[PDB]
Amino acid sequence: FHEMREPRIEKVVVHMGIGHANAEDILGEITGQMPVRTKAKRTVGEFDIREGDPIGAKVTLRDEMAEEFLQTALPLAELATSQFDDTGNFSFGLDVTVNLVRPGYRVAKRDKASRSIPTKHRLNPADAVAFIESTYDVEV
């Protein structure tokens, strides 16, 4: 029961919300894989009337790439309980978002007979802090 209940990292999303790009290059080095362009929506007074146009870049790491990054990434932050989502997620900062979830999360990500994960199988800030804190660092 506990085996299919113990949390895990689904994805590590590192992104730099600029506002006009050239920054892609560093993310590629700090993470290990190709970054992606970020387009914006709606016209913006702040000389941002152009809808589809580069404004940021992100990277979604999964599995090793995720941990190998967090290893030398988490030590760079001072995690606090507040910095945690209601789903058991947390982000710090260049931004670093960590998406944590239980074993059969795919049930809500597959094409056929997908289903929303029950509030019971959903992760919690509490169960989140633990898992993480239970690995190279401290909470609050």
Partner RNA sequence: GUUUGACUGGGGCGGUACGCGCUCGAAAAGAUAUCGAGCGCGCCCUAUGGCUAUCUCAGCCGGGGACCCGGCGAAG
Asked if 84 interacts with RNA (CB under 7 A), we say: yes
Asked if 28 interacts with Na ion (CB under 5 A), we say: no
- β-partners of residue 13 are 60, 97
* Least separation in angstroms between CB 135 and RNA: 18
Residue 31, contacted partner among Na ion, RNA, none, CB below 5-8 A by kind: none
- Of 61, 66, 90, 128, which one interacts with RNA (CB under 7 A)? 90
- Of 4, 46, 47, 64, which one interacts with RNA (CB under 7 A)? 46
Residue 37, contacted partner among Na ion, RNA, none, CB below 5-8 A by kind: Na ion
Asked if 37 interacts with Na ion (CB under 5 A), we say: yes
* Least separation in angstroms between CB 31 and Na ion: 19
Asked if 112 interacts with RNA (CB under 7 A), we say: no
DSSP letters along the chain, please?
--TTTS-EEEEEEEEEE----TTHHHHHHHHSS--EEEE--S-BTTTB--SSSEEEEEEEE-THHHHHHHHTTGGGS---STTB-SSS-EEE--EEEEEEE-GGGGGGTSSTT--PPPTTTS--HHHHHHHHHTSSS---
* Least separation in angstroms between CB 47 and Na ion: 17
